[PDB]
Amino acid sequence: EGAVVILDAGYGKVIDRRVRELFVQSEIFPLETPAFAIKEQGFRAIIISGGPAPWFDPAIFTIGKPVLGICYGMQMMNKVFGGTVHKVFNISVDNTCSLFRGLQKEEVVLLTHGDSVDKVADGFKVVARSGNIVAGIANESKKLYGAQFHPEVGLTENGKVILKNFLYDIAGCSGTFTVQNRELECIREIKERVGTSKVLVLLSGGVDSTVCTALLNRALNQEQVIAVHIDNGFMRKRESQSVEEALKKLGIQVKVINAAHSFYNGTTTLPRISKTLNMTTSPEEKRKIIGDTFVKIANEVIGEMNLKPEEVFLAQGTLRPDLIESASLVASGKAELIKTHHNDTELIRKLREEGKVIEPLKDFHKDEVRILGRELGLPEELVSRHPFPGPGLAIRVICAEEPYICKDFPETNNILKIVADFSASVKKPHTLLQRVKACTTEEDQEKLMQITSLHSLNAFLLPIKTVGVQGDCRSYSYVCGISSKDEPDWESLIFLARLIPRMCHNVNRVVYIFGPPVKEPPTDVTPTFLTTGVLSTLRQADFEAHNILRESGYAGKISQMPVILTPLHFDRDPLQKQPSCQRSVVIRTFITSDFMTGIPATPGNEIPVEVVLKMVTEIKKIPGISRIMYDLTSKPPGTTEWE
Amino acid sequence: HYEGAVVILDAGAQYGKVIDRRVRELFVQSEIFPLETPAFAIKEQGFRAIIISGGPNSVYAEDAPWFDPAIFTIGKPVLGICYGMQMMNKVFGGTVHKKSDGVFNISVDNTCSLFRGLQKEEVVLLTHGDSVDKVADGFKVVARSGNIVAGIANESKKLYGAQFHPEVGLTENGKVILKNFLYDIAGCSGTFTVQNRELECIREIKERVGTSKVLVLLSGGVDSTVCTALLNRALNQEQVIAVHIDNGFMRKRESQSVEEALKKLGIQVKVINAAHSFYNGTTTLPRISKTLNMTTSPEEKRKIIGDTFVKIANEVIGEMNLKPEEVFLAQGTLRPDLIESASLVASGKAELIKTHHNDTELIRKLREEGKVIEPLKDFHKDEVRILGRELGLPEELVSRHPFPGPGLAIRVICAEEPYICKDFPETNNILKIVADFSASVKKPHTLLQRVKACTTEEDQEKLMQITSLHSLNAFLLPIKTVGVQGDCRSYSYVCGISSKDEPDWESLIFLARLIPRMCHNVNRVVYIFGPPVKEPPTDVTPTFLTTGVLSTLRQADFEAHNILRESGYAGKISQMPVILTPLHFDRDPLQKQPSCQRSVVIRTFITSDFMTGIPATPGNEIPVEVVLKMVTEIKKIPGISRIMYDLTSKPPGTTEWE
Ligand SMILES: O=c1[nH]c(=O)c2[nH+]cn([C@@H]3O[C@H](COP(=O)(O)O)[C@@H](O)[C@H]3O)c2[nH]1
Ligand SMILES: O=c1[nH]c(=O)c2[nH+]cn([C@@H]3O[C@H](COP(=O)(O)O)[C@@H](O)[C@H]3O)c2[nH]1
C-alpha cells in the first residue's frame, strides 16, 4: 500500500536494499505468489528478478500494475506475451523509454550469461541493445519493462537512476519510506502494544540498548520506561557515566546497580560447581558465570520493583531476536541471555512466556539504528561507538597460573626459528628445513627468502592460550610472537601472519611485539586473574588506545579494536632468575562486514603507523607493562576477541 | 634462476595474489616479492618484467612504504597499477593534484603498446585516490577519464602505468592489457603451462627421491589418485608402492574402479581389505571407546577411524620391511602442514600423519626424518584435474566430488534412544504456529504474540502468504545433527516439514532460513516427501554402523548419485551427502508398531570454499524432476520409510550431518 513487491527466482535482498535506499517500502515474496494476493495488499508495482520452469501466476503481468523484469523476470515477461528465445559491457539504451529517461545513449551495465530474446513479444519494443543481444524491452501502455542487466548492483553505474525511474516516474511512489516515518510508525505500534503498562529495559550501555531506551521513552510517558543498568565491573573507563549522562540530558533517568562484587565473586553450576570468576582461567567458564549472574540479578531487580507483573514489559535492543537461544552459543559468544533457560529466573521466564518481551528495533538494520539515535537526540559520538561484548573486559584478560606448554612446544619453536631466519637457514640445510620446504609453496618459499634477508626477525611461541577457529570449530592454542631488530615492515609481517598458521595448525595467532628483539622469550607467566588491580590496568590501557584512535580521526576505519592484557613479562635475564611480575598489552584491530571473516588493520594502510606507535608509546608508561603487541591475524584463524 | 618470469611487487596484500592468478592464466611464471625488494636483486634473479600494485593510498603519505626507486631504471619493462602508477609518476618527477571508485567507460590511446588491439572507449574499474597533475617527464598520457589521467607511458624505457585494475574481470579487456604487457612488451613466451609445470615437477621428484621407494596411501579421492599417477610417471614401476586401505565406509564399487583405472595405466595398487578392522575398531577417549559399530557419537567415529587408519598404515609399512631411512611417503594434499591441529582431526578434514598417534613409530620416523613429500603442493584445485587428464586418468575419475575420509560412517545417524530435551514440546508448539501462521493469526493466543515479537514485519508478511497457499506441518525430529552457529559446532534438532500439496521450493527454502533464526536449538530444516506427516514419530529405529545398515545407505547413495550423473547436473553441485536416519514414519499411533524402518536424506550442496554454502533449490540449480526420480527410486529399497531433502544453508547447517 504505497509499497512495491519483489519476486525473486534465486538478488531479492539486493533489490530490497536499493529500493529501501530510495525511500520506498519493499517486501519480498515467493515467486508463486498469486496476483490477487498482490492486488489485495495494494502494492503499487512489482519487481521480478532471477539468475541465468518455476510456477508463477502470469496475472502478475496482467492486473494493471507497473512491472519491472530484471533478467529472468524479463524472460518471463517476454515469454508470457508470446516472445521466444534462440541459441560488464557498454550498451546502447533508448533514453526515450520511461525506464531510461535521463540516461546517455551509452551505459555501463552488468550483463549475465544465459538466454536472450529472439521474437520480441507483441506490443513490446526493444529499448536496449548489447551488440545484437536484446538488452531491454518495453510496453509503455501496459507499463511493463524488461532489462537483461541488473540495475540493482553498483557495477551498473546508473542503476540507481533506472530504479528511480521505475519507482517514482512510472509507479508513482512518493519516497516517504524513510527512517523518520518508520520511527513514527514504530512509535505507534509501541503505543498500541504496551498501552498503559510499564516497560523495563536492560540497558547495557551499548548502542542498540541506548537507542531502544530512547525510542521507548519517546513512544511512551516518562513514568512508563524504567531503564536499568547492571554494571558487571568489566565496563570500560567513563563510558557507563557518559551513557547515563546522555540519557539524562533527554529526560530519561537510569537506575544503576553496582553489581561488580557479585560478578567478581560470581559462581555457577557447570554443564559440577565453578570456581569464583576472579579465580577462573577458562573463557567458557567466564561466559557462563557472567551470563548466569546477570540473569539472577536481573530477575531479582525486577522482583524488587513492586510492579503489577501482568502490566510489565521487558524491552531489548536486539536486532535479530530469537524465541529460543542455545546455551552452546551463550558459552562461546554473543547470545540473548533472557531467551535461554535458567535457574532462579522465574519473573523473566513469565515475561517471556506471557509475550511481554519486545524488540522495537527488530525492523531496523544496524546503520538505521544509528540514524534512529541521531533523530531521537543522542550524540553522534555515542551512536557511532564500536560494539563492546556483554562480558566486557573479562574476555580480554588472558588468565593463567601456569605457562601453556604442550609436548609440541619445542618442535614448533624449532620450525619457527627456521621460518624467521629462512634465507640464512637455507645455506645450512638440516632435516627440519627440508620439512619446511616440503610443506610450503615455491612462491611462498621465494617470498620468504626475500623477507627474511631484508629483515632480521625472531619468531617463537608464547606460553599462552588464545581462541581461534579451525574449520567449523573453536580451538584454544598458542600465540606466536614476532620481533625485529629494525623498524617493522608491515606487509611482510602480515604475510608471515598468514603463512605460519598455514604451516602450524597448532598456532591460532601471530602477533608483532614492539621494541628491541626478544632474544629469550619467557617460558613462564605472570599469575593473572580477574582481580580489581588487573582490571584497573587494562581499563587504563584500553582507554588510551581508544582515545588515541578516536582523536586521530581513524576510529571509523576499523570495525572493532579489542585491547587485551596477557600474563607475559619480557626481557628478564634468564640467568638472573627474577620472577614474572609484569604484563603485556595486545592491540587487536579488526576490519569486517559481518564478523564471520575479517582482517587486522595493516599500519601504513587502513591506519597510520604514527597512530599505532603513539598507542605503544602511551601504554608502555602504564605501571606494570612489559611489552605492547599488535595482532596480525585474520579471521580465520584469528577471531575478533582473544577468548 | 627466473628467466621467462615476472615479478610482482605488491604494496598491499590484496592485488598481488590476483595479478599472480591472472599472469598464471596467461601461461607466464609469476613471483610475488616485497615492495622493498632492491633493484639489483630483481636484476640478478633474471626477471623479464615487473608489475607493481597496491591501493588508493597516497605515495606522498608520511606512511608511504619504502621501495628502491632503481626498480624503475634497471631496464626491464614495468607495469604500474594504481599505487604502482603513482609510484612511477613520482619517481620521474611528476606531481599529484592537491584535491582528493566505480566502473567507468574511459578513453584509451590505441597506439600505446599496452593498449594495442583495443577500442578507444574501454570499461575499467577506476580506483579513487590521488590523481596525476604534472605528468612525469618522458611520459605521455595514454588513457583518460574525463579530466583525470588514467594511464601513462614512456615507450622508450617500456614503462607503463594505469589508474585501473586490469587484473579484475570487471575490467572487461584487462586480460588483453596484461597480454600486451607480458607478450608484446616484455617478451614472455608463455611456457608456464600445466604441461611444463608437470615436467618440472617430475624432475624435482626424481631429484629428491633418487632410487628410494615411495609409498603413497591411496584414499581413492582425486588428489590421492593424481599424486599416485604422477609419482608413477616420474619413477619406475618398482619404486612406487600404492596402498589402498578400504575402511568399510566407501561407496558402491569405487575402490575397485579406482584400482582398475590405475591398473589399466600400468599402476599396481595393494588393496588392504580392512573393513572388519574398522567396524570393530576402538580407541582411547580424549578409557576405551565403544566399538565403531556401537558408537553414536561422531567425535568417537572420527577418532576411531582416524586412529585405526594410521595404525594399519604403520602395520603395512612394517610388513613390507621398508626402512624409513631409505623410503618416502607421498600425499596428494594440496595444502600440507608441518603440524596438524588436534581439534581438526576430531571434527573434519585434516592431515592424519601430521599429528601424534600412539604406536605408529614408522610413520612418526618418516615425518621426523623429512620423508613426507607433497607433489601437488604447487598446483591449484583446477590444475589437479588437468594434470590427471594429462597423466591419462579418465574424465569421470578426475571429475568426482570430494568424499570425506570417514566416508559413510558420518552419514548414518546412529541411535539407540530418541533425542528429546526439555525444550521439545515448546519448540513443537512454535513450529506448529509457524506452519499454520495465517490460520493461527486468525485465532491469536500468547504464543503467537511471542512469534510476532521475534519476527520482522517482512517475515510475517512473507509467512502469511506461504501458510495460506499451502497446508504445511512443521515439527522436530527426535535426532541430532551437527550445525555451526557463530564460531562454534553444535549438535541439535532437525526440523521436519511436510505438505498436503506439491512442494513450493522457494517457500520451503525461506522457511528453512526463518526457523533456525527463531529457534537456535534447531540446526537443520528438511522437506519430507510424500503425504502429510500427521503424527511425527517420538521413537527411533535403533541404528548403528552395521553391515546391513551400510548396505542400505550404500545402495541409496548409489541411486541418488547415478540419477544426478545421468541427468548432466553432477557438475552443478559441489557435493551431495546422502544420509540415513533412524526414522520410521506413517505408523498408526493407536497400534504400537515398533520403529524398524529408516529414512533417507538428500543433501545437495553448493559452495566456493566449504566455509559457507547453499542447498540446490529444486527447479533452480537442479531440475525438480531429477530430485523426484531419486525419491521414486530410493523409496523402492527395502527398509526405507521416507525421503527427505535438506533445505539448510551453511550456516547454521554444515555440509555433512555429523
Ligand atoms: O555480547 C557478546 N558476548 C560475548 O560473549 C562475545 N564474544 C564475542 N563477542 C563479539 O562478537 C563479535 C565476534 O567475536 P569473535 O570474532 O571473537 O567470535 C565481536 O564483535 C565480539 O566482540 C561477544 N559479544
Ligand atoms: O576427510 C574428511 N574427514 C572428515 O572427518 C570430514 N568431515 C567433513 N568433511 C568434508 O569437509 C567438507 C566440509 O563439511 P562440513 O560443512 O560438514 O564441515 C565437506 O566436503 C565434507 O565432506 C570431511 N573430510
The per-residue DSSP string of A22-91 comes to: TT--EEEEETT--HHHHHHHT-SEEEEEE-------GGGTTSS--EEEEEHHHHHHHHHTT--B---EEE
Helix (H) or strand (E) holding A609: helix A609-621
Phi then psi dihedrals of residue B43, to 5 deg: -60, -45
Choose among B80, B61, B102, B71: nearest CA to B163.
B80
* DSSP 3-state of A180: helix
- Calculate how far, in angstroms, residue A641's C-alpha sits from the geometric centre of ligand 1: 6
Q: Which residues pair with A139 in a beta bridge?
A: A144
Please report which ligand is nearest the Cα atom of B301: 2
Q: In sequence order, what are the residues at sequence separation of 6 or more whose Cβ sits closer than 8 angstroms to the Cβ of residue A180?
A: A375
Task: Measure CB to CB from residue B506 to each of A31, A471, A504 and give the nearest one.
Answer: A31
The three three-digit cell numbers of residue B188, written as one number: 614472455
For residue B284, what is the DSSP state? B
Q: Check pocket membership of B575 for ligand 2, CB cut-off 6 A.
A: yes
DSSP string, B172-196: TTHHHHHHIIIIIIT-------HHH
Per the CB < 8 Å rule, is B41 touching A324? no
Rounded CA-CA distance B615/B606 in Å is 6
Task: Measure CB to CB from residue A434 to each of B34, B370, B612 and give the nearest one.
Answer: B370
* DSSP 3-state of A561: coil
B83, B55 Cβ separation under 8 angstroms: yes
Query: Residue B55 class from Cβ within 10 Å (0-12 exposed, 13-18 middle, 19+ buried)?
Result: buried
Ligand 1 pocket test: which of A277, A560, A641, A642 has the largest number of ligand atoms within 8 Å of its C-beta?
A: A641
| SS3 track for B24-44 | HHCCCCEEEEECCCCHHHHHH
Task: Measure CB to CB from residue B488 to each of A328, A438, A450 and give the nearest one.
Answer: A328
Pairing of strands A67-71, A45-50: parallel
Residue type, B334: L
Query: Residue A172 class from Cβ within 10 Å (0-12 exposed, 13-18 middle, 19+ buried)?
Result: exposed
Residue bearing cell 544509528 = A370
For residue B504, what is the DSSP state? -
Q: Which residues pair with B543 in a beta bridge?
A: B415
Helix (H) or strand (E) holding A460: strand A457-470
Task: Measure CB to CB from residue A471 to each of B347, B367, B454 and give the nearest one.
Answer: B347
- Calculate how far, in angstroms, residue A472's C-alpha sits from the geometric centre of ligand 2: 10
User: How open is the CA angle A637-A641-A643, to the nearest 5 degrees?
Assistant: 90
The three three-digit cell numbers of residue B546, written as one number: 552395521
Residue type, B630: M
Q: Check pocket membership of A288 for ligand 1, CB cut-off 6 A.
A: no
Choose among A105, A39, A115: nearest CA to A71.
A115
Rounded CA-CA distance B383/B389 in Å is 10
* DSSP 3-state percent helix, strand, coil across chain B (nearest 5): 35, 20, 40
List A97, A107, A152, A480, catalytic entry: A152
- Calculate how far, in angstroms, residue B349's C-alpha sits from the geometric centre of ligand 2: 5
Question: Which resolution in angstroms does this entry have?
Answer: 2.5
Å from A46 to nearest chain B CA? 15
B35, B83 Cβ separation under 8 angstroms: no
Pairing of strands B140-145, B148-154: antiparallel
Considering only CA atoms, give the Rg of chain B: 30
B272, B244 Cβ separation under 8 angstroms: yes
Residue bearing cell 621398508 = B322
Residue type, B58: S
- For A451, which residue in chain B has the nearest alpha carbon? B34
Residues of B in contact with A418 (CB under 8 A): none
Ligand 2 pocket test: which of B331, B335, B401, B610 has the largest number of ligand atoms within 8 Å of its C-beta?
A: B610
The three three-digit cell numbers of residue A60, written as one number: 502478475
Rounded CA-CA distance B73/B5 in Å is 18
Query: Residue B3 class from Cβ within 10 Å (0-12 exposed, 13-18 middle, 19+ buried)?
Result: exposed
Rounded CA-CA distance B436/B467 in Å is 6
B575, B402 Cβ separation under 8 angstroms: yes
Q: Check pocket membership of A390 for ligand 1, CB cut-off 6 A.
A: yes
Rounded CA-CA distance B6/B19 in Å is 11
Residue A31, number of CB atoms within 10 A of its CB: 25
- Calculate how far, in angstroms, residue B645's C-alpha sits from the geometric centre of ligand 2: 19
For residue A209, what is the DSSP state? H
Rounded CA-CA distance B313/B310 in Å is 5
A448, B34 Cβ separation under 8 angstroms: no
Pairing of strands A312-315, B159-162: unpaired
A185, A222 Cβ separation under 8 angstroms: no
B577, B439 Cβ separation under 8 angstroms: no
Phi then psi dihedrals of residue B358, to 5 deg: -90, 135
Residue type, A583: R
Rounded CA-CA distance B504/A335 in Å is 32
Handedness of CA B418, B422, B423, B429 (dihedral sign): positive
Residues of B in contact with A477 (CB under 8 A): 341
A76, A62 Cβ separation under 8 angstroms: no
Residue type, A379: P
Rounded CA-CA distance B420/B569 in Å is 38
Crossing angle of helices A532-551/A609-621, nearest 10°? 150
Rounded CA-CA distance A11/B443 in Å is 35
Helix (H) or strand (E) holding A366: helix A366-375
Residue bearing cell 612525469 = B136
Query: In angstroms, what CA-CA distances link A596 with A637, B529, B530, B651?
Result: 11, 34, 38, 10
Phi then psi dihedrals of residue A242, to 5 deg: -75, -20
Rounded CA-CA distance B119/B110 in Å is 7
Rounded CA-CA distance A105/A92 in Å is 5
Phi then psi dihedrals of residue A26, to 5 deg: -135, 110
A525, A464 Cβ separation under 8 angstroms: yes
Phi then psi dihedrals of residue B604, to 5 deg: -75, 140
Rounded CA-CA distance B414/B294 in Å is 8
Query: Residue A403 class from Cβ within 10 Å (0-12 exposed, 13-18 middle, 19+ buried)?
Result: middle
Q: Is B137 left (phi over 0), alpha (psi -120 to 50) or beta?
A: beta
Query: In angstroms, what CA-CA distances link B50 with A609, B85, B86?
Result: 27, 12, 15
Residue type, B567: S
Helix (H) or strand (E) holding A463: strand A457-470
- Residue B82 annotated to the active site: yes
B505, B618 Cβ separation under 8 angstroms: yes
Residue type, A164: K
Per the CB < 8 Å rule, is A8 touching B506? yes
Domains, chain B, with CATH or none: 1-190 (3.40.50.880), 191-411 (3.40.50.620), 412-657 (no CATH)
Measuring from atom 4 of ligand 2, which residue has the nearest CA? Answer: B348
Helix (H) or strand (E) holding A409: helix A409-420
Q: Buried (b) or exposed (e) across B601-638, using 16+ Cβ within 10 A?
A: bbbbbbeeebeebbbbbbbbbbbbebbebbbebbbebe
Rounded CA-CA distance A151/A166 in Å is 11
- Residue A439 annotated to the active site: no
A554, A510 Cβ separation under 8 angstroms: no
Residue type, A359: E
Helix (H) or strand (E) holding A188: helix A179-194
Per the CB < 8 Å rule, is B521 touching A324? yes
Å from B54 to nearest chain A CA? 10
Q: Which residues pair with A357 in a beta bridge?
A: A314
- For A635, which residue in chain B has the nearest alpha carbon? B487
- For A336, which residue in chain B has the nearest alpha carbon? B520
Q: Buried (b) or exposed (e) across B540-569, using 16+ Cβ within 10 A?
A: bbebbbeeebbebbbbbbbbbbebbeebeb
Residue B176, number of CB atoms within 10 A of its CB: 17
The three three-digit cell numbers of residue A155, written as one number: 557495477
- Calculate how far, in angstroms, residue A299's C-alpha sits from the geometric centre of ligand 1: 24
- Residue A152 annotated to the active site: yes
Rounded CA-CA distance A416/A405 in Å is 15
Peptide bond into B589 cis (omega under 30): no
Experimental method: X-ray
Choose among B30, B399, B28, B48: nearest CA to B196.
B28
Q: In sequence order, what are the residues at sequence separation of 6 or more whose Cβ sits closer than 8 angstroms to the Cβ of residue A335?
A: A291, A325, A326, A329
Rounded CA-CA distance B54/B17 in Å is 11
- In chain B, the largest separation of any two C-alpha atoms, in whole Å, equals 94
List A97, A107, A150, A342, catalytic entry: A150
| SS3 track for A499-556 | HHHHHECCEEEEEEECCCCCCCCCCCCCCECCCHHHHHHHHHHHHHHHHHHHHCCCHH
The three three-digit cell numbers of residue B596, written as one number: 524398524
